[PDB]
Design a protein around this nucleic acid. Sequence first.
RNA 1: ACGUCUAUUGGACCCGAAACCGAUCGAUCUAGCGACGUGCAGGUCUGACUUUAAUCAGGACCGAACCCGUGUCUGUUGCAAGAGACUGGGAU
RNA 2: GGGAUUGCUGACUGAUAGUGCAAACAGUACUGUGAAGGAACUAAUGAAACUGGGCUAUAAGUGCGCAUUCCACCAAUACGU
Lengths: 283, 51, 158, 120, 79, 50
Amino acid sequence: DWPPGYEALLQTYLEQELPLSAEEASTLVAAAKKGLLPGSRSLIRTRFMHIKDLEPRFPGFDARAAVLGEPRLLRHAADKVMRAMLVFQDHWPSHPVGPLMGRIGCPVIRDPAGVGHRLYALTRALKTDLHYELDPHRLTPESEGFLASGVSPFELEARVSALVTIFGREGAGRLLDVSLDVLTYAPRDLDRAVLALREVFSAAGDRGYGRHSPEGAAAAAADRGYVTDLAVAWPGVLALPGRLGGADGVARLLARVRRAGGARYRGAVGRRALLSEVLERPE
Amino acid sequence: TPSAGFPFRVRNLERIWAELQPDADXXXXXXXXXXXXXXXXXXXXXXXXXX
Amino acid sequence: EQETRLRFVSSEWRSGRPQPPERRIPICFPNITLQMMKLTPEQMDQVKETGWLREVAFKTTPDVTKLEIAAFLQSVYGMNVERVSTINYLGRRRLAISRNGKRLWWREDDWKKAYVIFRPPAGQEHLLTRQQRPVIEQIREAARAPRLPPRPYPWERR
Amino acid sequence: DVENQGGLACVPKPCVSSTGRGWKVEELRLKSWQDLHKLWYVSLKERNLLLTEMGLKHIPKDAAHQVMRRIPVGAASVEEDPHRLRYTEVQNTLRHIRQVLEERAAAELVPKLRREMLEV
Amino acid sequence: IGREAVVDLIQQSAAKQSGIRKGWQVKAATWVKRVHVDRGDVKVGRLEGGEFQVLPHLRPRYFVPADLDKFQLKPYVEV
Amino acid sequence: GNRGNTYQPSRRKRVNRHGLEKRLSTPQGREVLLRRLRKGRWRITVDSFR
RNA sequence: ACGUCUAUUGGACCCGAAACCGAUCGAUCUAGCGACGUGCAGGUCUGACUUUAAUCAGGACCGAACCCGUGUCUGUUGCAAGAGACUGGGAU
RNA sequence: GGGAUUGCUGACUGAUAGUGCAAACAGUACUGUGAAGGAACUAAUGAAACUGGGCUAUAAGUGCGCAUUCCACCAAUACGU
Ligand SMILES: [Mg+2]
Ligand SMILES: [Mg+2]
Ligand SMILES: [Mg+2]
Ligand SMILES: [Mg+2]
Ligand SMILES: [Mg+2]
Ligand SMILES: [Mg+2]
Ligand SMILES: [Mg+2]
Ligand SMILES: [Mg+2]
Ligand SMILES: [Mg+2]
Ligand SMILES: [Mg+2]
Ligand SMILES: [Mg+2]
Ligand SMILES: [Mg+2]
């Protein structure tokens, strides 16, 4: 519905109005304007000034970092954002909402029981695990999962129990030290992806699950170690079924054809993320 | 006359939808025609939020 | 000359769900037809001065939309359209008996009737221009009223 | 402004507004795209007036509806009504404007004609 | 023998006996009140949760000229 | 049991049996349509309209 | 050779079968199957579960809605190219 | 072999004939679920059946319209008007 050439007019209008550098202004004009934010001038200015007037009222809130870290804060009314972080702040007397509103745009809508209870249950569900603190600062805007309206705290309890069941809790703790987005997956889908990874990246024998369960169990444990080390190295390998359960081998051979066989490549892929280009080529 | 009418993708003049027609290839649209596609649904919400 | 194609019910059932177009162009040279029906003579005097009525009914073609009638009236005739209500009508059947008696049967082209509710233009809003009686007395009077007679038959003399 | 289709407004008085003829293709080839655009809008509003005016009277149009209404051919004093003659001339004008526009669209050389066949 | 060739021959046969819907077409015209036939409208949107949403770029816009008043060309040419 | 009323009307069954698309779906239905055309019938199928 | 009359091959003076062989259309009547959905008033008997308790079973019984058509009568170019009345059979 | 123009072609037919159809809309109305079947109808004249009453009891002219051939203009090679 945009007037042809409105993108240049909006970029120029953002420079002529409120102070914002052109690169992040282009991020608002182009990257976050497929939807996610209203395209009207004289409406983003009103909300931006209104959210700029909420930095004194909240101690850790910087408007520019918050609107660039998660750009869907401006498709909601500024008064609703003010009330949403106020109510969520009462359900979480701890680290202030100002450092947390710039990472999570989920509490704008379902704050009251949702973000507070899910965060409390996740902190308790990882505290009852082997000493995981789960401070909310590390959360990325892709963590809409495990915080969206519709996941129960019992579902998070089952998810962390399944994550420390599918991976060993030492491996699960090492996996959860980086990229908590693994918590977004449902336990059945995470089990499917890990089993498919164990099938395709089977270091024990063939593409089939080699060494079926003395030394067969040793090879099976080594396969579980290899898949958890790949998961520690890269959380994106858990997103294999977006391509296929049978195209994991296809991507692995797309990497394989260059020089030699499987054992050299199990050492090579564990040292560098060569699978990301192969997955992007498959997409 | 065929002297004019040449490819003029940038003959817009930047008017909300009076530049859409000469971007799709136009002298003056009526104000009533632009009034038919209402331009005040977002304007009222912007004014209410400002006040 | 190219004209109306035959359509088939099984064909529209199988190749169903027409999709919306990807781009809509502003309509230079539009092909859209409206006509009023008969008005009461006092409504005609109401139109002769100041050019307005609250409710006007139109004949259109069935390929139009409430949005298209509202946009066309607002764009061309400068009116303020509040709501449109559209009715699809069949054509009238026509009988035109021949030189040998055949009963030649025709069918008029199908039309859509729009009921357009208008709005007073600017500052002129006074021309909406309209004692009491109890509704209990209304119902009690309309219950002791004589009944409507049954409809006479076309051969029956009364 | 509903007076435009509401009535001729000159027919209730005993006077004829249009005493002329309809546009021809050779005259219409000499008019520009903007002039043809304005003439098209004026002619469509005239078409709505004439259709409404012959809908208030019960008179047919097109000479194929006249067979349907059982009205005789020519000798009926119905083809001689002013609104019907004006309506036929207005339809001729709109058809000729469409014919000129496709002729100009077929008379082009580059992808501009794919845009010229999108506004007609 | 092909499917499109048979349909094209059917339409060419139906090009004859066309005009103001005489004969069997008078009864066949009443199929629009029996099987929900979609007319020749342009769609302006799609259903997401059962609520229809009109896409604003598909709303009808009419490019009417600036003034059709005192414009020097009328629909009629003098003889 | 009184006979004579074998025709139980239904628009779904009428279009699904004797409509255009079941005639076009099979080759011998297409020659049925072709000889309907060669005879000169005004109504090609039971569901044709305009 | 023409004309007429016979004869043979042709449908061969005309009309009339039951037929046989192909390949169109028909499960909107009816038979079976399949998917989805809906219905079975009121009571009676027997067995089981739980009982401070608003549960189940029987190709169970009597009996409306519903399904069928035993006997008699009417009707027999009839109301009907198989119907009506009264008795009947089934009705978790 | 097949599909359309022309026939100063017809001891072919002339509206129960000739195509199923000479016609405002014939493969139509109508019949059938369907494939499929499939009519009647020109303009005048007005026979019989039938039913009431009564009774008995000068192979020519003159006008128009063309075609043929003359003529004079012709593309100048079949005629072009
Ligand atoms: Mg409606
Ligand atoms: Mg029965
Ligand atoms: Mg029958
Ligand atoms: Mg001899
Ligand atoms: Mg069948
Ligand atoms: Mg009984
Ligand atoms: Mg009994
Ligand atoms: Mg005959
Ligand atoms: Mg006869
Ligand atoms: Mg014959
Ligand atoms: Mg006669
Ligand atoms: Mg006589």
